[PDB]
Coordinates of C-alpha atoms in Angstrom, one line a residue:
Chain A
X28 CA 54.0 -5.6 -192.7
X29 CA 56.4 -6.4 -195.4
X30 CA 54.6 -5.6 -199.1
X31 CA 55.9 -8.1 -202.3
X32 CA 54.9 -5.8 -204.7
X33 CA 56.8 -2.8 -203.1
X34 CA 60.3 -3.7 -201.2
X35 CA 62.2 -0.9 -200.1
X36 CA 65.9 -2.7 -199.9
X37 CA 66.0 -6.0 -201.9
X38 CA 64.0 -7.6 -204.5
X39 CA 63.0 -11.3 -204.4
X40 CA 62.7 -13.6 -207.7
X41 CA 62.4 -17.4 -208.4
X42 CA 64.2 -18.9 -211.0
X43 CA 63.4 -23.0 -211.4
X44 CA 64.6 -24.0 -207.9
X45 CA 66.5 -20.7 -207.0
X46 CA 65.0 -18.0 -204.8
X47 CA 67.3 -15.0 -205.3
X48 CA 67.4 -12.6 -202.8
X49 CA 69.1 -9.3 -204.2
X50 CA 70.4 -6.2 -202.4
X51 CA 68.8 -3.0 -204.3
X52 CA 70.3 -0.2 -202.6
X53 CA 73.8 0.2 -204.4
X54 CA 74.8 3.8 -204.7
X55 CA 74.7 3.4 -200.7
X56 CA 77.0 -0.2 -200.9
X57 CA 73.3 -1.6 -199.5
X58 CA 73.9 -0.5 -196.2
X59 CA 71.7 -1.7 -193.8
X60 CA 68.5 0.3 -192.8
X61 CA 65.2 -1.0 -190.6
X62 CA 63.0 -2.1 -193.3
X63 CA 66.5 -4.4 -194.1
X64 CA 66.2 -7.3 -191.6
X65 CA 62.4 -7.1 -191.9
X66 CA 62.6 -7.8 -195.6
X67 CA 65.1 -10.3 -195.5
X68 CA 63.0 -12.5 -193.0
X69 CA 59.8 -12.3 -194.9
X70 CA 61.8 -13.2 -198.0
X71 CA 63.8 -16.5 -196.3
X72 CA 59.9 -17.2 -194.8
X73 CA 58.6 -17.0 -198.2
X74 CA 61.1 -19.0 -199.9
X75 CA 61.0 -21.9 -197.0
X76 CA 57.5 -22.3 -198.2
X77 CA 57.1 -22.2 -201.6
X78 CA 57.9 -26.1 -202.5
X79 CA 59.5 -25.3 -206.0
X80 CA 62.3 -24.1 -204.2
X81 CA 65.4 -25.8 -203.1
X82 CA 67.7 -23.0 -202.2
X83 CA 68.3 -19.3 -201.2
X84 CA 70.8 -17.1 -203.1
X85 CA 71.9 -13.9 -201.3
X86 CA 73.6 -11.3 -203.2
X87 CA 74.2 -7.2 -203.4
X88 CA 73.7 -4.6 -206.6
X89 CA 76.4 -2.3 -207.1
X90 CA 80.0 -2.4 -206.5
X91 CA 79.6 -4.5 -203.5
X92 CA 77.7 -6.9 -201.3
X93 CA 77.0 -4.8 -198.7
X94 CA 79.0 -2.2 -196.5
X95 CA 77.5 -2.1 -193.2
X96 CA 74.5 -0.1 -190.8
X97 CA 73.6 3.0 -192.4
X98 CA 74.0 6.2 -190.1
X113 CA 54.7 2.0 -187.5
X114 CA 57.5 2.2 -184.5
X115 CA 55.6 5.2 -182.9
X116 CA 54.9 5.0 -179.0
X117 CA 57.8 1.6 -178.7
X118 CA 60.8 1.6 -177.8
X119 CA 62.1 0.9 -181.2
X120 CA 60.7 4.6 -182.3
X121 CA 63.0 7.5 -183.6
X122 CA 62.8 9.4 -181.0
X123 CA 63.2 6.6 -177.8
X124 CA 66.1 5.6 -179.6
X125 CA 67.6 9.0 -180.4
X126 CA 67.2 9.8 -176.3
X127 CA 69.2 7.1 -176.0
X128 CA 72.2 7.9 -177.7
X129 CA 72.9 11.3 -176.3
X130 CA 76.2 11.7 -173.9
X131 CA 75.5 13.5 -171.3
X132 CA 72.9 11.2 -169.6
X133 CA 72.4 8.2 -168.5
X134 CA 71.9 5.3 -171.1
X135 CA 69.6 2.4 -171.4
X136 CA 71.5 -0.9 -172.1
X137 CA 68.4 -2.9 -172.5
X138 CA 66.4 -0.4 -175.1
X139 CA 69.1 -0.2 -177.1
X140 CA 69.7 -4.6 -176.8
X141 CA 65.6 -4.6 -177.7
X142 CA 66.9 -2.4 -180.8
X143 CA 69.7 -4.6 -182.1
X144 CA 68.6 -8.1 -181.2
X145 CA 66.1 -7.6 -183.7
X146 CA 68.3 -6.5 -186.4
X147 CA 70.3 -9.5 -185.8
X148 CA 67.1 -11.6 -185.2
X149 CA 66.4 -10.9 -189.1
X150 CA 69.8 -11.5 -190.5
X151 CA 69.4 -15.3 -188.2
X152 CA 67.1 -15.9 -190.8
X153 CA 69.9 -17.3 -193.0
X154 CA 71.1 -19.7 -190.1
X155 CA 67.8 -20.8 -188.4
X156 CA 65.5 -21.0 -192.1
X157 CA 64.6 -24.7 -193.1
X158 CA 66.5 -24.6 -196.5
X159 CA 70.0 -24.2 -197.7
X160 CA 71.6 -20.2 -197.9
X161 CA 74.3 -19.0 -200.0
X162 CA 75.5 -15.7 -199.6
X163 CA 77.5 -14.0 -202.8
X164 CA 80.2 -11.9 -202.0
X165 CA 81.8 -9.1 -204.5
X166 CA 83.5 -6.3 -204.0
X167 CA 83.4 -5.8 -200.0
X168 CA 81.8 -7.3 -197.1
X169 CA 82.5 -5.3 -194.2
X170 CA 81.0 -4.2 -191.0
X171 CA 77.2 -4.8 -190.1
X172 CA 77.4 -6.3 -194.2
X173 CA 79.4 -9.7 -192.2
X174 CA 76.3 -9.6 -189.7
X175 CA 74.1 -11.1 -192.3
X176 CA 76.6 -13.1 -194.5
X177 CA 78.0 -15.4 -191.6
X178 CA 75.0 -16.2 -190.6
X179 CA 74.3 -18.0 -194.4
X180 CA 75.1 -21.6 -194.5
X181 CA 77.5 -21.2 -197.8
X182 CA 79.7 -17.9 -198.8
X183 CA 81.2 -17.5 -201.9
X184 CA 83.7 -14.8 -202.9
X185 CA 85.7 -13.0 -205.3
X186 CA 89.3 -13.6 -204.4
X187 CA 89.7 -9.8 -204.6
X188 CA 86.6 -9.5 -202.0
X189 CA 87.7 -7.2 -198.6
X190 CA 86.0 -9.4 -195.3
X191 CA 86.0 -8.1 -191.5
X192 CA 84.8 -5.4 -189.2
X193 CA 86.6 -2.7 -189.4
X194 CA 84.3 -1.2 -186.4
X195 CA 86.2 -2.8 -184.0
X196 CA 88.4 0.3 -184.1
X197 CA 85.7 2.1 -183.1
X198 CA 81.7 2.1 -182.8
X199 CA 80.7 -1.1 -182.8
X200 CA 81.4 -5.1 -182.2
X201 CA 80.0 -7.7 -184.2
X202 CA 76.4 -8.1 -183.1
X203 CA 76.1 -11.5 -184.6
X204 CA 78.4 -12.8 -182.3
X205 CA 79.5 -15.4 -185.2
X206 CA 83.5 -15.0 -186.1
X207 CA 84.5 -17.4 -183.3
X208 CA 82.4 -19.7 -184.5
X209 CA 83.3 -19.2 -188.2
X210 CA 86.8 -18.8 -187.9
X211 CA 87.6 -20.7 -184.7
X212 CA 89.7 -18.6 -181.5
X213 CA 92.6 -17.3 -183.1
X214 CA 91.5 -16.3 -186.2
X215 CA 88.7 -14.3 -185.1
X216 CA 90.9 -12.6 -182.6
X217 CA 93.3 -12.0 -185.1
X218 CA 90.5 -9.8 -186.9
X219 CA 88.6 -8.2 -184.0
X220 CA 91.7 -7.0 -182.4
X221 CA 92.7 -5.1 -185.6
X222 CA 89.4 -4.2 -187.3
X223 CA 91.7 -5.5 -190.4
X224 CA 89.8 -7.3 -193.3
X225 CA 90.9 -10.5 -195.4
X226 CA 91.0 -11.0 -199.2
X227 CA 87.8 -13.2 -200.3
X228 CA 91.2 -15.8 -201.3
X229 CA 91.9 -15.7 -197.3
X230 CA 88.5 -16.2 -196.4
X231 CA 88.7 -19.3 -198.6
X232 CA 91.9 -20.9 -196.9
X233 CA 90.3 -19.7 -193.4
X234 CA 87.2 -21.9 -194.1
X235 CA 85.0 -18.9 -194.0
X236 CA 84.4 -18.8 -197.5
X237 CA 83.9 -22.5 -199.5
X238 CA 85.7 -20.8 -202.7
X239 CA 86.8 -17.8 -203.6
X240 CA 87.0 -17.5 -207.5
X241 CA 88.3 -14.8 -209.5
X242 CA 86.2 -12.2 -209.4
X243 CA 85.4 -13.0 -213.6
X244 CA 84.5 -16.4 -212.5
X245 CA 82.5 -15.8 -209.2
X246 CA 79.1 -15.1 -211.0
X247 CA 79.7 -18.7 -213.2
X248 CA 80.9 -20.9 -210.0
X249 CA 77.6 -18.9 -207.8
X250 CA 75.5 -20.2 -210.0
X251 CA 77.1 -23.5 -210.8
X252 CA 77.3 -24.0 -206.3
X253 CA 73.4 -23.3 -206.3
X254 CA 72.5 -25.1 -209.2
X255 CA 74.2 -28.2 -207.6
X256 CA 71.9 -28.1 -204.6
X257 CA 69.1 -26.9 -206.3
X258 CA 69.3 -30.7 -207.7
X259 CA 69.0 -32.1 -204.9
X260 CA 65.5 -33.3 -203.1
X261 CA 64.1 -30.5 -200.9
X262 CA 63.3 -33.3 -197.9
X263 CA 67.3 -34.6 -198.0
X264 CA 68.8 -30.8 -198.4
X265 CA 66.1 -29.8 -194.9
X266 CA 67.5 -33.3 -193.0
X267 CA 71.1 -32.3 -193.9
X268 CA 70.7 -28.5 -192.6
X269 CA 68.8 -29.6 -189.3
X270 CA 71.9 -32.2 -189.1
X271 CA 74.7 -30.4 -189.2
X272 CA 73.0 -27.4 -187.7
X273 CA 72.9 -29.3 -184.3
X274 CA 76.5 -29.2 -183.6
X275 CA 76.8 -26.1 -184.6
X276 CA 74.4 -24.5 -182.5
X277 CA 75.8 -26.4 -179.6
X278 CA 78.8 -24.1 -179.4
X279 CA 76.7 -21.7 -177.8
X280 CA 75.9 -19.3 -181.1
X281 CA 72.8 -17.8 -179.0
X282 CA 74.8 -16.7 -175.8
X283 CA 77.5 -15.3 -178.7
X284 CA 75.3 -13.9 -180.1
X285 CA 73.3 -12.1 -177.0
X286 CA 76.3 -10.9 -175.3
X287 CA 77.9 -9.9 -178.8
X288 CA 75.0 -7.7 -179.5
X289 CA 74.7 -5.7 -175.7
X290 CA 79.0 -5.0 -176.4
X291 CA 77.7 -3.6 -179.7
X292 CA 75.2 -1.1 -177.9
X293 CA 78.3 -0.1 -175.5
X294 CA 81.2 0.6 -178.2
X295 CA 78.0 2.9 -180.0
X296 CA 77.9 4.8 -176.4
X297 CA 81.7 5.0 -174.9
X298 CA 83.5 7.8 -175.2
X299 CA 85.3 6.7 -178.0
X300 CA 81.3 5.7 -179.8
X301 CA 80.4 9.0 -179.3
X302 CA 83.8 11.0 -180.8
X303 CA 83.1 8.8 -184.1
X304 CA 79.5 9.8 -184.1
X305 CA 80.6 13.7 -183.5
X306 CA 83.1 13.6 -185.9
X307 CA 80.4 11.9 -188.6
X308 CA 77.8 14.5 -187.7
X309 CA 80.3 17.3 -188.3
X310 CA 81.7 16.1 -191.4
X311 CA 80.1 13.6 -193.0
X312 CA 80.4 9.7 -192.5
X313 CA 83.0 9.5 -194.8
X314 CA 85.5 11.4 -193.2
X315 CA 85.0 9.8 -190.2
X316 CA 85.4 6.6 -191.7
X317 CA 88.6 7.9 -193.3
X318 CA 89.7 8.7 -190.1
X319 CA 89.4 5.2 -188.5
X320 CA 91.0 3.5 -191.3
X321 CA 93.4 5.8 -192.9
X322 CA 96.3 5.5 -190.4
X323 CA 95.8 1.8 -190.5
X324 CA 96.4 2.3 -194.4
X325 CA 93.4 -0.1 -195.5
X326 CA 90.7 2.8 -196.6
X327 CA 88.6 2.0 -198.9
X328 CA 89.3 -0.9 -200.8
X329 CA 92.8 -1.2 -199.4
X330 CA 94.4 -4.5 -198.5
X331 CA 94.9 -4.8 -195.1
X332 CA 98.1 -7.2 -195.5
X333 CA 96.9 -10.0 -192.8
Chain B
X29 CA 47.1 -10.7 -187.5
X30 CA 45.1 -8.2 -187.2
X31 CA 44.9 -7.4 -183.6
X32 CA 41.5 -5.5 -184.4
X33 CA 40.0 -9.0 -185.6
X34 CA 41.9 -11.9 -183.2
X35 CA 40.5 -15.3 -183.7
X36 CA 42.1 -17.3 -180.8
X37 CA 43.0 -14.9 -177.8
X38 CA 42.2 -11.5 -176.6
X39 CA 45.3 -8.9 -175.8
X40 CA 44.8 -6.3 -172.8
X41 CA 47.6 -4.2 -170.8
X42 CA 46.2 -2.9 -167.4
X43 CA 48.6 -0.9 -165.6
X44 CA 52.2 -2.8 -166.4
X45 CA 50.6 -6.6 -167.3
X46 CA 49.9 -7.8 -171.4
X47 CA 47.1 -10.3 -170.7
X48 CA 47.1 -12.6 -173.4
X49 CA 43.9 -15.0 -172.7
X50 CA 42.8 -17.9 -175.2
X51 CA 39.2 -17.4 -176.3
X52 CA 38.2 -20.5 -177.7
X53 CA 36.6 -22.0 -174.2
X54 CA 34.2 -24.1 -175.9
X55 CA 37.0 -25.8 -177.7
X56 CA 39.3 -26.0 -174.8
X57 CA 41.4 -23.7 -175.9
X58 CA 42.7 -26.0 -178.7
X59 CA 45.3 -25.1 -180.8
X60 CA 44.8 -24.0 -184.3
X61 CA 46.7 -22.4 -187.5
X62 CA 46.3 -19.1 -186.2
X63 CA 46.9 -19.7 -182.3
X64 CA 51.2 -19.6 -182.7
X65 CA 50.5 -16.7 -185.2
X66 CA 48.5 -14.5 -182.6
X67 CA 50.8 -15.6 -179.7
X68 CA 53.9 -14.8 -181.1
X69 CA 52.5 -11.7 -182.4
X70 CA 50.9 -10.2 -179.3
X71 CA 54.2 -11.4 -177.1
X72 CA 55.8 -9.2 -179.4
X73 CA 53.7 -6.5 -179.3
X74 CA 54.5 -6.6 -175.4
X75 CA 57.8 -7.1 -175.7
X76 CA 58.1 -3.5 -177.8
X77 CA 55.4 -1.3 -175.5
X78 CA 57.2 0.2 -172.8
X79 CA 54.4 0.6 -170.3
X80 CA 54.5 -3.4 -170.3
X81 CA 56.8 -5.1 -167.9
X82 CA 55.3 -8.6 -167.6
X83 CA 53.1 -11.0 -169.9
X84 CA 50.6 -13.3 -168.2
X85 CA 49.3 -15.8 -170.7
X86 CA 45.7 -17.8 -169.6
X87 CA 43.1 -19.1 -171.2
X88 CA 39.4 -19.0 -170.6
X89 CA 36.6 -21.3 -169.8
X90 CA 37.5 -24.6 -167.5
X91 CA 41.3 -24.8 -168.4
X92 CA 44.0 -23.4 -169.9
X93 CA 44.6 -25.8 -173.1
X94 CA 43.8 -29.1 -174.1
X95 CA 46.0 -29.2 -177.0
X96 CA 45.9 -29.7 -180.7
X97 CA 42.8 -28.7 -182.5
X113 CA 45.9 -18.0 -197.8
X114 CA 48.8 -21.0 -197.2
X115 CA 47.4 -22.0 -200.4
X116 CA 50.4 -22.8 -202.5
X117 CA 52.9 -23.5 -199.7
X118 CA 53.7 -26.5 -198.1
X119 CA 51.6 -25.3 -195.0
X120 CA 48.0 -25.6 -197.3
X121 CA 45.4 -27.7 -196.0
X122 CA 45.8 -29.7 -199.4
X123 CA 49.8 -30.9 -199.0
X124 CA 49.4 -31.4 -194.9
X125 CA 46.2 -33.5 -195.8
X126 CA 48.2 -35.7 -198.1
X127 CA 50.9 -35.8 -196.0
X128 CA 48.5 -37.9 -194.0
X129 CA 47.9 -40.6 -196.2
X130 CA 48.9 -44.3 -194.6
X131 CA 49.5 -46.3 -197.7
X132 CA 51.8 -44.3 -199.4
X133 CA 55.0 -42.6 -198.1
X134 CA 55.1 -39.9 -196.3
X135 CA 57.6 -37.2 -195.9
X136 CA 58.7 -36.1 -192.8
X137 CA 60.1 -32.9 -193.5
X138 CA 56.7 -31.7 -195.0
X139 CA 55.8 -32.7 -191.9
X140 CA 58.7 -30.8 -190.0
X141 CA 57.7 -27.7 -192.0
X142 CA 54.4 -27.0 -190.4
X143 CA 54.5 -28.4 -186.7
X144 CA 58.1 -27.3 -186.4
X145 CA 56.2 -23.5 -186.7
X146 CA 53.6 -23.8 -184.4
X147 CA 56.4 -24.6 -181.8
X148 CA 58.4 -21.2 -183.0
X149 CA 55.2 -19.6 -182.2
X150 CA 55.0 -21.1 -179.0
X151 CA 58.6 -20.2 -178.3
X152 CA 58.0 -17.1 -178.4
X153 CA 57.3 -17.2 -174.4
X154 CA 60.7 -18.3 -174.2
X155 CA 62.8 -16.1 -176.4
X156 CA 61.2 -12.8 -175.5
X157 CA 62.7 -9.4 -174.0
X158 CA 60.4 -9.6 -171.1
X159 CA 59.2 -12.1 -168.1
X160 CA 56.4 -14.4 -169.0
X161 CA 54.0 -15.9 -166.7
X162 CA 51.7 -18.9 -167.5
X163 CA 48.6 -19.7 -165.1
X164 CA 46.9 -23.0 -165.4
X165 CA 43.7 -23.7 -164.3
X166 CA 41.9 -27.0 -164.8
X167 CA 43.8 -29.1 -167.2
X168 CA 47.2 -28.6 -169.1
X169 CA 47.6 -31.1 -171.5
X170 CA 48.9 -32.6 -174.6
X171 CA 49.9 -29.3 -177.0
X172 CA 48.8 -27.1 -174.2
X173 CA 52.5 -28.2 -172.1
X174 CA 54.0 -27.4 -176.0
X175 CA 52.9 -23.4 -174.9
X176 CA 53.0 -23.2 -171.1
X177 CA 56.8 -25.2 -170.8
X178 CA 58.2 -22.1 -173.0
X179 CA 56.6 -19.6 -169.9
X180 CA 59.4 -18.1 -167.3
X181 CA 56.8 -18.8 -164.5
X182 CA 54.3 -21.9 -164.5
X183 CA 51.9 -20.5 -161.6
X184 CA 49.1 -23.7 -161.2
X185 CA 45.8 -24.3 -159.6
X186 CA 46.9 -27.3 -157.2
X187 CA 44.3 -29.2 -158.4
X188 CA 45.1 -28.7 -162.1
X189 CA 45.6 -31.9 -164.3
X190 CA 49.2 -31.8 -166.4
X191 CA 50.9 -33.7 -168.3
X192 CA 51.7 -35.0 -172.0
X193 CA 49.0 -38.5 -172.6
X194 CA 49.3 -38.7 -176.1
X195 CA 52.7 -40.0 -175.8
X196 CA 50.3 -43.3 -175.3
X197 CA 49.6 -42.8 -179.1
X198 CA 49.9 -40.1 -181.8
X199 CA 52.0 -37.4 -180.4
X200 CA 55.7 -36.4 -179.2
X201 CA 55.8 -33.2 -177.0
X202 CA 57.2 -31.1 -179.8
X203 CA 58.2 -28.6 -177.9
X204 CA 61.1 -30.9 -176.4
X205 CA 60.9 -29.2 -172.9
X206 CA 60.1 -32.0 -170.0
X207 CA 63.8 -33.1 -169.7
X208 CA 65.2 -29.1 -169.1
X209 CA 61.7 -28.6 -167.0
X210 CA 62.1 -31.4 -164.8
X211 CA 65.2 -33.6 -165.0
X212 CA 65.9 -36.6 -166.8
X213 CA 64.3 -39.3 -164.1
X214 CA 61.3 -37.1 -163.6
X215 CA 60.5 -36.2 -167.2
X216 CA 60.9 -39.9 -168.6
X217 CA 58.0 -41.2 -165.4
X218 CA 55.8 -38.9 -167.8
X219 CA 56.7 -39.8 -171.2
X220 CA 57.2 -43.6 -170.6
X221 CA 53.6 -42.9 -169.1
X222 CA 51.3 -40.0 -170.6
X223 CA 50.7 -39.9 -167.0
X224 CA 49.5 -36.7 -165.2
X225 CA 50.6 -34.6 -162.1
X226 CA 48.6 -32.5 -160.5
X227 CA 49.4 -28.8 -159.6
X228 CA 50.7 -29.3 -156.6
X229 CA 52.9 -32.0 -157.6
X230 CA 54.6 -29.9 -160.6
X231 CA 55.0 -27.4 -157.9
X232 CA 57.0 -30.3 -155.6
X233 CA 58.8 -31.1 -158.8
X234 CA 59.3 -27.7 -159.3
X235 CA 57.4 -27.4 -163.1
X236 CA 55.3 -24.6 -161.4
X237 CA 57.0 -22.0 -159.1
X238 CA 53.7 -22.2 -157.0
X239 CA 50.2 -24.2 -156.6
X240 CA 47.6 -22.2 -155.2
X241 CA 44.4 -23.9 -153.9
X242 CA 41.8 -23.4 -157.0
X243 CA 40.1 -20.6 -154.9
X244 CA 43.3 -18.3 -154.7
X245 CA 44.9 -19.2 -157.8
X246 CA 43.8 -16.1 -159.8
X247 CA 44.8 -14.0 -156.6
X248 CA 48.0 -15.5 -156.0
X249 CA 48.5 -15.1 -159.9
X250 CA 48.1 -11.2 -159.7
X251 CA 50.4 -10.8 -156.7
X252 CA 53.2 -12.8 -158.6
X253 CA 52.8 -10.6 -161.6
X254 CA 52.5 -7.2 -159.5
X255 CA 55.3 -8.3 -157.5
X256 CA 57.3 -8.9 -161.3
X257 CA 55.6 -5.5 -162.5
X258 CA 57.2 -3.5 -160.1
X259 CA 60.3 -3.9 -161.4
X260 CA 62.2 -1.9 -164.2
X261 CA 61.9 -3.2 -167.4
X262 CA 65.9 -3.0 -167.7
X263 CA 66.3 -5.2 -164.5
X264 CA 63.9 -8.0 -166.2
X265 CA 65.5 -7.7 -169.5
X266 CA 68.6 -8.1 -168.2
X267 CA 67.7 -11.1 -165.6
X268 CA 66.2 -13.0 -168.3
X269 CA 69.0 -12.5 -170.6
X270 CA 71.4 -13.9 -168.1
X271 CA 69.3 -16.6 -166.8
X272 CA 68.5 -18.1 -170.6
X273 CA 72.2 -18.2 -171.3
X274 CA 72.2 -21.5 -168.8
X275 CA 68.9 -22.6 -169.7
X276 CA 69.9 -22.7 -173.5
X277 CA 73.2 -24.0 -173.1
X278 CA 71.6 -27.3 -172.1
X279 CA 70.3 -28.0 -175.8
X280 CA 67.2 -26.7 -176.0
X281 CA 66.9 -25.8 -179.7
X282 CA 68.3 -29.9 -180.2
X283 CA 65.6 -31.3 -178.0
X284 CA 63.4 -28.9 -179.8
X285 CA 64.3 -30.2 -183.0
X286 CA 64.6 -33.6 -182.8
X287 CA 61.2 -33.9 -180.5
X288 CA 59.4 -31.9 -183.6
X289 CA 60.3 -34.9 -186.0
X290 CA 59.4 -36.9 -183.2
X291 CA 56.0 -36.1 -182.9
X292 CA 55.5 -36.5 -186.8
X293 CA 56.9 -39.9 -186.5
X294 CA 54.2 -40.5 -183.7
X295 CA 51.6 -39.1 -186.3
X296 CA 52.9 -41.5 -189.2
X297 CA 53.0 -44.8 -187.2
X298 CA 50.7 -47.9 -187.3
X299 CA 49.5 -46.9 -184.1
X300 CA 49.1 -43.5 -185.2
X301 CA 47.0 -43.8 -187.6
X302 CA 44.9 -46.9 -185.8
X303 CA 44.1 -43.9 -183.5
X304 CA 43.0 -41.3 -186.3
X305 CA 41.0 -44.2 -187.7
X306 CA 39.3 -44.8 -184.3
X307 CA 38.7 -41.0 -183.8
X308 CA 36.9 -41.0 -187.2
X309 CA 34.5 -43.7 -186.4
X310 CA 34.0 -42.9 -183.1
X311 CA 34.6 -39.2 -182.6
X312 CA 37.7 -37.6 -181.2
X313 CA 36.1 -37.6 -177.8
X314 CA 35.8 -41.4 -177.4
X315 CA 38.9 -42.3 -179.3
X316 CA 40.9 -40.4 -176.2
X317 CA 38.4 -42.1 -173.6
X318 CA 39.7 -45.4 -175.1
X319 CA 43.7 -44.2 -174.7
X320 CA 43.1 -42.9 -171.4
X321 CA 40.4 -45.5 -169.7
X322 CA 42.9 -48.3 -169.6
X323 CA 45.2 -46.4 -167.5
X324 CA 42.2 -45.4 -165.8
X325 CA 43.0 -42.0 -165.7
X326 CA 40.4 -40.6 -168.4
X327 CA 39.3 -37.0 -168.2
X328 CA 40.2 -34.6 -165.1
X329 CA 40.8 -37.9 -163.1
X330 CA 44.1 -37.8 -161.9
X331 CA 47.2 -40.3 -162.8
X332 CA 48.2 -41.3 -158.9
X333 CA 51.8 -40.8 -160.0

């Protein structure tokens, strides 16, 4: 059970209208960890509660918003040591333990998407990986023009278990980046529609606050009507079934071949090497452009 | 919840079955605050124990549910639903929305889970007891079991939003234009149950079904559930959900609406249904002759 007074990942505090929601793991680019979903859907409960306020912001500590997974559960399936069985290579694999694993990852991060009130997610810095999990699910992004967007695990060790980009980007767009594993500039994400603006990065914390502070004016009741509207079509494109079938692919690329050289390779020599790996011959490590 | 201290349903596995069994017999079963809290809690703890395969959700006493029955400082406190309530000044739906969309999540659950869930109704399902035992994989019925949605006659909506994707457009709307009941063995014919056991076999036809579904690898299930629910939701449930939530806090808002809350405070809640239902002269377990 999720304890107010001691979250591991994020913090949580209300200011007038405004239930911020902020990343607290930042010397690890708040990379995702189990207690992360769990707090972020105790949080988005809490906040759709509390009548004082009219809208979540979600934002990440540290030099970005949130880079991706990070490399009481005793006697389930979700327990260290089922789920370690499970990923070794030279037997046989459960499909459906590792699904009951990631589902409920993703289940949290739907939070954002399915939660009575209006989300905004901030984006500085970077926004890649399992970090684009949680931010397209939010009903408003906002980024720095100089942000880096995408899932760069494409290449190898993963597919987008949200199942969203289709949905956020439209057909060829989201093929253009799950094909690649290339990332956008926050400025791209603007004229893509997945962002609503992408100001400089100086100006991204003043026009944040400004976006919020113009629905935080708004009545509770008309900003729940207008989410449950426009939420109808888009759950009608089939999110769920995206979403369920985007999240058992994401178990396989973790156990192919190819999953477990990346995983070897990390083990060996650190996770950073093997992400250097993945990326550098594609010439976008790190913070590098990836020219789309 | 505190599955040491339950206040609405007990939780048992024996051998590869979660028995999740309302205890509130003396109330019908009725729904309260913490009923969608315990289900959706113990449906979870199933879905994560790997010597579960199947959930098999009844209640006690004469039938399964009868229907509708700390948040201090929310919009879910006793205090802002009670004034939500008022007639003679406005109301606000999504206050509303708030709370009864939450007990439907809870009752979802049944729905949305990793593994197979099994519903077995005995007696009478009715009213909010349809808003839990539509979300169930398999509806297994006593054939003389009464079930249906009567408050559509006054004060409610089926929140859950389910008849249409249960039974078909023609088929649900002779219930809702109604708040008339089927039997058992009609909901089997219509195919709302997957069986309708005579009274005396039900509970032995119920732990054949659920042996025969325990059998099974959990990976199988999982998997046959998964690809089952990607037609079943791609017919608009979570809309029908939706809109039948606001719905049903329209029908608690209404003239007639409250006319019926007035009745049921003069009279009792008891007599206030005997004067919905005695006009259509299908009051109690008598059935609707549909």
């Amino acid at each position: 059970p999720v304890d107010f007074d001691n979250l591991k990942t994020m913090t949580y505090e209300v200011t007038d209208r405004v239930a911020r929601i902020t990343f607290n793991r930042p010397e690890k680019g708040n990379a995702i960890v189990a207690d992360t979903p769990l707090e972020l859907s105790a949080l988005v409960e809490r906040a759709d509660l509390d009548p004082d306020v009219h809208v979540i912001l979600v934002s990440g500590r540290g030099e970005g918003f949130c880079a991706g997974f990070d490399l009481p559960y005793e006697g389930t399936v979700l327990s260290g040591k089922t789920q370690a069985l499970n990923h070794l290579p030279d037997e046989p694999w459960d499909p459906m333990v590792d699904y009951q694993m990631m589902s409920r990852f993703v289940r949290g991060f739907a939070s954002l998407m399915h939660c009575d009130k209006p989300t905004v997610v901030k984006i500085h810095g970077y926004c890649v990986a399992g970090g684009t999990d949680i931010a397209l699910h939010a009903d408003q992004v906002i980024a720095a023009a100089d942000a880096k967007i995408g899932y760069p695990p494409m290449r190898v060790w993963g597919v987008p278990a949200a199942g969203l980009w289709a949905h956020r980007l439209g057909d060829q767009r989201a093929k253009r980046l799950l094909f690649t594993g290339d990332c956008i500039t926050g400025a791209q994400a603007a004229e893509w529609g997945l962002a609503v603006e992408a100001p400089d990065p100086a100006d991204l914390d003043a026009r944040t606050e400004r976006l919020v502070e113009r629905i935080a004016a708004m009545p509770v009741n008309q900003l729940i009507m207008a989410k449950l509207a426009c939420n109808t079509a888009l759950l009608n494109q089939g999110v769920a079934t995206s979403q369920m079938v985007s999240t058992v692919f994401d178990g396989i690329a973790r156990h192919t071949p190819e999953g477990h050289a990346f995983v070897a390779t990390a083990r060996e020599h650190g996770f950073r090497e093997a992400v250097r790996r993945r990326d550098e011959p594609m010439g976008d490590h790190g913070r590098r452009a990836s020219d789309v």
